[PDB]
Amino acid sequence: QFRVIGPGYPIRALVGDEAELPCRISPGKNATGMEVGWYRSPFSRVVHLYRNGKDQDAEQAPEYRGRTELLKETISEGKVTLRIQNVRFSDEGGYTCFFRDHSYQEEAAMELKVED
Amino acid sequence: QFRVIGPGYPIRALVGDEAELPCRISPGKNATGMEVGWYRSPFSRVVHLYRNGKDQDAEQAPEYRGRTELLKETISEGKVTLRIQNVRFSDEGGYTCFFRDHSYQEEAAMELKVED
């Protein structure tokens, strides 16, 4: 079993630039074969979904197509970073990050603040 | 500014019984005049919404009507507890708790495990 950890305070980003949201499982372990999903909150929509070792472009909301990447230089340690390219004003708000290992899952919620 | 804290590991509950999900802001302060919202995740739906000093029954999803209470014996310390009456199998899964103070908000995500 593991808990999912994200930043406790708002992540700041400049509109037009890139924003990065960190998320990891603890205790850390290889999360390469896990499902990692990012969603908006409170009103849900798929930001990015990674499962079966690949990013699932067809499953994310149209607005995120080609604008997201799940960086994995440290996924073997249980850490991932969602990168939002060309941050939009509407990207401001809540996000939920999930890590799912078969029948078990946990998640963390976090806030993104967009500045003009 | 404050961060929102919830349990890191799954909260267990027996189907048919009551389940309780804790959530608080830190540093703690009186949250009586804040908006507190609970939602399901990843697929969103309003579990319970408290704002302007009152529980907003009309805003929660039909399935939660009359089945939820936001306990406030310690809301003055920044803590609240969502009580789900007559827990259902479908209540299993993710939940997101928000605390909103005017233009500022933060949240925490947590998991509920329902046993038969």
Topology readout:
Two copies of one chain form a homodimer.
Chain A: E1 3-5, E2 11-14, E3 19-26, E4 35-41, E5 46-51, E6 54-55, E7 68-71, E8 79-84, E9 93-101, E10 104-115
Parallel strand pairs in A: 2-10
Antiparallel strand pairs in A: 1-3, 3-8, 4-5, 4-9, 5-6, 7-8, 9-10
Main location (chains A, B): membrane
Family (chains A, B): Belongs to the immunoglobulin superfamily. BTN/MOG family.
Subunit structure (chains A, B): Homodimer.
Structure description:
The structure is a homodimer of 116-residue chains. In chain A, β4 and β5 form a beta hairpin. Chain A has a single domain, classed as Immunoglobulins (Immunoglobulin-like). Chain A has a 6-stranded mixed sheet, with no helix packed on it. In chain A, strands 1-3-8-7 form a 4-stranded antiparallel sheet, with no helix packed on it. The first copy, chain A, is an all-beta fold and 116 residues long. In chain A, 0% of the residues lie in helices and 53% in strands. The first copy, chain A, has strands at 3-5, 11-14, 19-26, 35-41, 46-51, 54-55, 68-71, 79-84, 93-101, 104-115. The first copy, chain A, contains no helices and 10 strands. The interface between A and B is medium-sized, with 25 and 25 residues. The PDB classes it as immune system. Keywords: myelin sheath, multiple sclerosis, immunoglobulin. It forms a dimeric assembly.
